[PDB]
A paper describes a structure:
8-Oxoguanine (GO) is a major purine oxidation product in DNA. The major way to remove GO is the base excision repair pathway, usually initiated by a GO-DNA glycosylase. While no enzymes with an A/G specific-DNA glycosylase or a dGOTPase activity have been discovered in these species, a GO-DNA glycosylase called AGOG (for Archaeal GO-DNA Glycosylase) has been initially identified in the hyperthermophilic archaeon Pyrobaculum aerophilum. Despite very low sequence identity, AGOG is structurally similar to eukaryotic and prokaryotic OGG1 and OGG2 GO-DNA glycosylases and, like these two proteins, belongs to the Endo III structural superfamily partly defined by the central helix-hairpin-helix (HhH) element followed by a glycine/proline-rich region and an aspartate (GPD).
To get structural insight into AGOG bound to single-stranded DNA, we crystallized rSB using Pab-AGOG and GO-containing single-stranded DNA. rSB obtained between Pab-AGOG and a 13-nucleotide single-stranded DNA containing a GO at position 7 in the presence of NaBH4 was purified to homogeneity as described in Materials and Methods. Best diffracting crystals were obtained with a 9-mer single-stranded DNA, allowing us to solve the structure of Pab-AGOG borohydride-trapped-DNA complex (Pab-AGOG_ssDNA). Four complexes were present in the crystal asymmetric unit, each showing a slightly different conformation for the DNA molecule. As expected, the covalent bond between the ϵ-amino group of K142 and the C1’ of the ring-open form of the AP site is clearly seen from the electron density confirming K142 as the catalytic nucleophile of Pab-AGOG. Few nucleotides are contacted by the enzyme: 2 and 3 nucleotides at the 5’ and 3’ side of the AP site, respectively. The single-stranded DNA is bound in the groove between the two protein domains and the HhH motif. Pab-AGOG interacts via its R93 residue with the T1 and T2 bases at the 5’ DNA extremity and via the Q53, G56, G58, Q97, R101, R104, T143 residues with the DNA phosphodiester backbone or deoxyribose of the residues PED4 (AP site) to T7. At the trapped AP site, the phosphate group fluctuates between two conformations and a large kink of about 90° is observed for the DNA backbone. In the structure, the AP site is stabilized by Oγ of S175 and the amide of the strictly conserved R176, which form hydrogen bonds with the O4’ hydroxyl group. Compared to the apo or 8-oxodG-bound structures, the protein sidechains of residues F146 and W212 show severe rearrangement concomitant with the displacement of the helices α11 and α13 of the N/C domain.
Numbering used by the authors: -2 to 239
Write the structure that this text describes.
Amino acid sequence: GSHMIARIIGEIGIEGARFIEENIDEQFKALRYLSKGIDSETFVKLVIANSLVSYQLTGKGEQWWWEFAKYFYGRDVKSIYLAYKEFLPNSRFNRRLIPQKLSRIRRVETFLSTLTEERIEEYYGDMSSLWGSIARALGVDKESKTVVFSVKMFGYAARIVLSTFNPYPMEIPIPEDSRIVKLTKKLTNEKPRKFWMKIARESGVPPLHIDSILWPLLGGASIDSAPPELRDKLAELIKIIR
DNA sequence: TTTTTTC
């Protein structure tokens, strides 16, 4: 792992990650916008469906999640599969692997249909069971990138809908992808998957909350709105990993 | 433009 990184991430803490999530994270902003233009249950269903097709994008993540939010705001959505069948081929930022992606939506449509208000609250109180349930519906490994971040974005949606905050489970790990490998190789020769899981365990900050911290800081987003005590912590983290 | 997944 990294004692240097884990100590500063521990100082930032779940509440520092939460500040970034609710103030800087553009995915959270797009979700908060969408939640104002569609009913709560459809909102959460769409966010999970979107997460499951958000890979190998023809654009950057922030652009795509705003495109998704702007597309469904005020839209009358019945079948989520049918909605995506029309949305994806006309989108700007998600035009690759549409046949594969539509088939994943079709296969998870029955699980999404169980997401009443009460079911969404139950899963938000036990995101590990939601993690396993989504993977089982798809027939994939729950540690796969899309399933892990379907849980993260569900957590964004659920905290908006329910006006409560439950931290992500510690046992949901960041999987390896292109940008986590590119960054981690500069920091260490350790295996990226093991590196970041040990950092989460040592710091006390679940991996999905660490993810919220890393990318805005690396991408150069302003941290000036953070309170000075948290700002100085994020500043030191930047000097360590950027 | 190059920004995970398959059955």
